[PDB]
DNA sequence: GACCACGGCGCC
DNA sequence: AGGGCGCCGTGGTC
């Protein structure tokens, strides 16, 4: 079935690359054919072949499109058989496992590369035959979305990196005054980053009483968690959280970020892989920056680093309570829509009870705290993790538990008809259909089976969230482009936009539009938007 | 070097 | 008896 043509490939043909390196931005393009017919292409100068495609198809063509887009080629991704199939089934993440569960081997050389894809896409495109829904999101939603992944990855976002250069020596400085009090408290040195040798210490040598265990080798546990409930029994757990917090952020962020600058850009180009997770988000990989710190005040000396380019500004957008909105359109809960329709803010107000004080008195890192309460006891927390964790009586942990659900009726049952339907259908789905399957819905182990009930219930939501984002990236990137503003990160249900100063206000303002109406629901979709020379003041 | 499991932890 | 990610060291391989 397989010739080999000259080059010169027919339009539409599927290509076939290889690089030196999984990421586009920092990659050399080792080799690039095309498959179409039955005839195979190998371009003998790949780089300069790059200039003959009117567009990328086959696996990964965004990846291919970034690195055009970094070569000064405007090459747009088109069809891409790991959507296809990331949209059959999101266990799809890897071409090495869509090209063995579809018809083929993923290999090296790029002619069977883009013969892969072109027998690969035929196989996929056949199975989403019927599948009006996932066709849907496929043409309307994933590949345009592509597209706009790869300007993104390609634009890539300004980083102060002499303002981190200095940062690192600062704490460096104060991670020496934490270990080296540690040690003096331990009475002696040994590796702090070992978790190993700290619970030596902690459990073996101190006195301490050792509070839970590790999952695949059930070794006492030193986590944070552990370390909270430890703080007040010896003066060498506050050290170690302290240490463990500058250690993360300086290891994370502080010091690798800078060694990421592109030469060419001079900017941080992160990946935005499109088919990673199981409920239908992106994912941000090499430099992830969907976890930039924000928490804590080191945290956000690091967020200021993400910085717009000199005369532009950082417009960031993101969707209010996005998850309780999405769940008050799936569950159809009055009680829980008429909240939206209030103006309330149930972080706030959640908030307000933890720390105990009225509304106004609750301040932004007191309504964050209260987001991991409200969806933690959504999700399933239980009592003793929350009682455990906001330090209350088991008691009144279960009694807040009792209440939130009380409050909102038809969670529960909307919760109980999910799980029902995933029973029997084998997958859960989102409100445009995106698919999970969750066999262990059925597992005889109660452990198993709740476990994947919580995973099970939890993606409609989260995915429907992510829908949501996608069509909004969708329908806002064409706008942005005709006003000179750029996208340049998503962060799961917010943006970071990149504007001219003198029409910053014009996009922010557009953006939040196109945002908060992507597609209309039982409750609005607010957002929340800013502006700044930086990320942190952007927020 | 490269890469793995695991614990641990940054954000959503 | 919270869900979804990716990255960083520590040990231990190859
Ligand atoms: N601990 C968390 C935090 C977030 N999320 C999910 C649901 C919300 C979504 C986006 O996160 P944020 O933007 O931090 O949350 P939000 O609830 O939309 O709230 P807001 O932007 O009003 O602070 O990610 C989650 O599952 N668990
Ligand atoms: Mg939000
Ligand atoms: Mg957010």
Redesign the pocket.
Known sequence: ALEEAPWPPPEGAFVGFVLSRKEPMWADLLALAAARGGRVHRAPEPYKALRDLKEARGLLAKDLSVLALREGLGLPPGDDPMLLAYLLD?SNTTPEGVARRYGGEWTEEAGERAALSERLFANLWGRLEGEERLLWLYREVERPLSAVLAHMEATGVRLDVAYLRALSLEVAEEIARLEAEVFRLAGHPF?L?????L?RVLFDELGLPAI?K??????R???????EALREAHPIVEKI?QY??L???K??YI??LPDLIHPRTGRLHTRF?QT????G?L??????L???????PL?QRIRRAFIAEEGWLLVALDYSQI?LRVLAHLSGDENLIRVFQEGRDIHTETASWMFGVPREAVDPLMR?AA??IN??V?????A???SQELAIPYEEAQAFIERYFQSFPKVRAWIEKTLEEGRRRGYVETLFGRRRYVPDLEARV??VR??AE??AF??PV?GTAADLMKLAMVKLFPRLEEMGARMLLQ????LVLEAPKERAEAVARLAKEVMEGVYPLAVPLEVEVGIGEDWLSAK
Do not use: C, W
């Open positions: 999101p590796n980053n070992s978790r190993d040798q619970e839970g590790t999952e695949k080798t059930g070794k546990s030193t986590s944070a968690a552990v370390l959280l463990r917090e250690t993360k952020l290891s994370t010091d690798p892989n990673a997770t199981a409920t988000r994912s941000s990989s090499d430099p992830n969907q976890n930039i710190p924000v928490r804590t945290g998850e964050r987001k991991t969806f933690g959504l999700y399933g927390m239980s003793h993790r929350l109660k452990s709740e476990a919580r995973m939890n993606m989260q962060v799961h249900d917010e």
